[PDB]
Amino acid sequence: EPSWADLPFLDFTDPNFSWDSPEVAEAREKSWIARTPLALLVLRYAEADQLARDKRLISGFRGLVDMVGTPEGPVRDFMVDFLQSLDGADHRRLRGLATHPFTPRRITAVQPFVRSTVEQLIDKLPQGDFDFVQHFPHPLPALVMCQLLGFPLEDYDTVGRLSIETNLGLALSNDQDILVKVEQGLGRMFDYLVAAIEKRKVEPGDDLTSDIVRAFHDGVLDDYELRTLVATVLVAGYETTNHQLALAMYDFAQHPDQWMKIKENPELAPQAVEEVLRWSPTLPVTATRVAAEDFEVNGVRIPTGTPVFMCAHVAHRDPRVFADADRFDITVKREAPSIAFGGGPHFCLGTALARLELTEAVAALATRLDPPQIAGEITWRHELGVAGPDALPLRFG
Numbered sequence: 001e002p003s004w005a006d007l008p009f010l011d012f013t014d015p016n017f018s019w020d021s022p023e024v025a026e027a028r029e030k031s032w033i034a035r036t037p038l039a040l041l042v043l044r045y046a047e048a049d050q051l052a053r054d055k056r057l058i059s060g061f062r063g064l065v066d067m068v069g070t071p072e073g074p075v076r077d078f079m080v081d082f083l084q085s086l087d088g089a090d091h092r093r094l095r096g097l098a099t100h101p102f103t104p105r106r107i108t109a110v111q112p113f114v115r116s117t118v119e120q121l122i123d124k125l126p127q128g129d130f131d132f133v134q135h136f137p138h139p140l141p142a143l144v145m146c147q148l149l150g151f152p153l154e155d156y157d158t159v160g161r162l163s164i165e166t167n168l169g170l171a172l173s174n175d176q177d178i179l180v181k182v183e184q185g186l187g188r189m190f191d192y193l194v195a196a197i198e199k200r201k202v203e204p205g206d207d208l209t210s211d212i213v214r215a216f217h218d219g220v221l222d223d224y225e226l227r228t229l230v231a232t233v234l235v236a237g238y239e240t241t242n243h244q245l246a247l248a249m250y251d252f253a254q255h256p257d258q259w260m261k262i263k264e265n266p267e268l269a270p271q272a273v274e275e276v277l278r279w280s281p282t283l284p285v286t287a288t289r290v291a292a293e294d295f296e297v298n299g300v301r302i303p304t305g306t307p308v309f310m311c312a313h314v315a316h317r318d319p320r321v322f323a324d325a326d327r328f329d330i331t332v333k334r335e336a337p338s339i340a341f342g343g344g345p346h347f348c349l350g351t352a353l354a355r356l357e358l359t360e361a362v363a364a365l366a367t368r369l370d371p372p373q374i375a376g377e378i379t380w381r382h383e384l385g386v387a388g389p390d391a392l393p394l395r396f397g
């Protein structure tokens, strides 16, 4: 395309690439949209928010899977069939059956559980240098997922590890050898999920697994769709929340004075979480979309079949919308929210829940503990999709 000529080039698949490099900022200043090998990347806030819900764009995940050349198999079947790849009737149908526990009223019903779990987890924290992921960021969303999906709470470590051993990001590749491990992980996770699904087929409960089992008994979805949807919810609910919590500690370790502001006034925790989501969103690229038809935004024309990815990280650093955009500050009253959860019909199902987990965690950690200090080498996730510490050695003073 000729209208693509003057667009800035960025390659976020480069192991040398950084989201906070000067060339990224320069690209955003120059253009609302950048060119990448995989997609057009929307860099500014206004456009990134609006395009995530624009009806001219459908889900881009299937396009991604094919574009990276993921070979045929159970892993590919999951990535092309799961909720995030679906649109229209099929999407509304599946998403609807899993909505109820995430309604911002049922979120309030789970709030006391989230609080006490956080409280318990803080009680069992080590006194010295310890990995925050293993001791908090992993257990918290794992226990929450178990409570939502109806798994025994004692299985929280197993259920978490199941998701860890099935890194879907690694499978967005044509490599056969790395794929074997992802496929092995997927199978093991299904083994656990299917067994729990069969239990709920006999005796349905109040949980989400039982909810979806009820829809199966009413013939709204088939058996394959059932277990995929249970798998979709677990992965989407565990990985992001885990990494985002670890990123929260990372931010506050860099800015220990603002942690103290929350200690003094715990009511600052809601907008503190928002600042964490703004400054370091666990998914730098939020919404992956493909053009369903020909159209034109700001002169740049997008033909049918063009992948368009919303870059939340860069859009959060947009000075057109955010005051002192590159400074981490919890106290500034923001006019616009973070868009760490995407938009449109695909908008994060667990937005309210994720915010509840982050808020309760930050409030209690800041009230009870001294500012976090990095105590060793941080292990970062290098794959496409979820970003953040896989292991975070820290101390609370």
Ligand code: HEM
Residues within 6 Å of the ligand: 052, 083, 084, 085, 095, 232, 233, 234, 236, 237, 238, 240, 241, 244, 281, 282, 283, 285, 286, 287, 288, 340, 341, 342, 343, 344, 345, 346, 347, 348, 349, 350, 351, 353, 354, 355
């Ligand atoms: C802070 C952590 C989280 C972040 C940053 C996050 C972000 C996102 C984003 C950006 C999307 C893509 C939306 C789009 O295409 O516009 C998404 C989808 C989704 N999220 Fe989350 N999420 C988080 C936690 C959770 C939790 C706790 C759950 C609950 C299980 C959850 C469930 C889902 C589901 C089921 C989808 C697919 C929905 C669909 O395709 O319609 N997420 N999330």
Ligand SMILES: [Cl-]
Residues within 6 Å of the ligand: 088, 089
């Ligand atoms: Cl439709």
